[PDB]
Write a protein that binds this ligand. Structure first.
Ligand code: HEM
Length: 153
């Protein structure tokens, strides 16, 4: 369970992310797709993007980065009472999108990298530790849903 002080560190940096949801989303998806190319294969609509410049130019990719960060932000602001928000997400990503838990670890690592690039003064070690704990809780709760449905990752 994160303490209240850890949730404050998380939501203090996220309020910065929300100043520019679309640029943050771009940087995070592009990092994910470059570091782990297999994840790009899950998206029929982005499969055609071959270079980082093509990814940066894609309005559809930018739009989907806003979708992802908007849903994550809604979960974070629930501070670990996020059952209603998480359940629809785990069901679609297990049974429709077929995303293994491992890929949620990958995108977590991209999120933490981008936050540290863009917000050094609000993302020192103590915030980085709280954010890693929040994303682990996110993954742990999804993985429980996966297990129930027969997908565990
Ligand atoms: C922070 C983690 C993630 C969040 C909050 C998230 C959220 C979302 C949301 C809100 C949607 C649209 C509604 C829905 O289909 O349920 C979506 C769709 C999708 N997500 Fe995720 N997602 C995350 C991670 C991933 C990852 C790691 C992958 C793939 C490697 C993935 C693949 C997909 C696909 C294939 C779709 C449908 C996209 C389309 O063709 O319209 N998601 N995700």
């Amino acid at each position: 369970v994160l303490s209240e002080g850890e949730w404050q560190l998380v939501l203090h940096v996220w309020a910065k992310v929300e100043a520019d949801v679309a640029g943050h989303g771009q940087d995070i998806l592009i990092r994910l797709f470059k570091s782990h190319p297999e994840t790009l294969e899950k998206f029929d609509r982005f499969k055609h993007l071959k270079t980082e410049a093509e990814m940066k130019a894609s309005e559809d990719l930018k739009k989907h980065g806003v979708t992802v960060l908007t849903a994550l932000g809604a979960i974070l602001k629930k501070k670990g009472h996020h059952e209603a928000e998480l359940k629809p997400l785990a069901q679609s990503h297990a049974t429709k999108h077929k995303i293994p838990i491992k890929y949620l670890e990958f995108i977590s690592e991209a999120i933490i990298h981008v936050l540290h690039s863009r917000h050094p003064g609000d993302f020192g070690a103590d915030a980085q530790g709280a954010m890693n704990k929040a994303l682990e809780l996110f993954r742990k709760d999804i993985a429980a849903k996966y297990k129930e449905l027969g997908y565990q990752g």
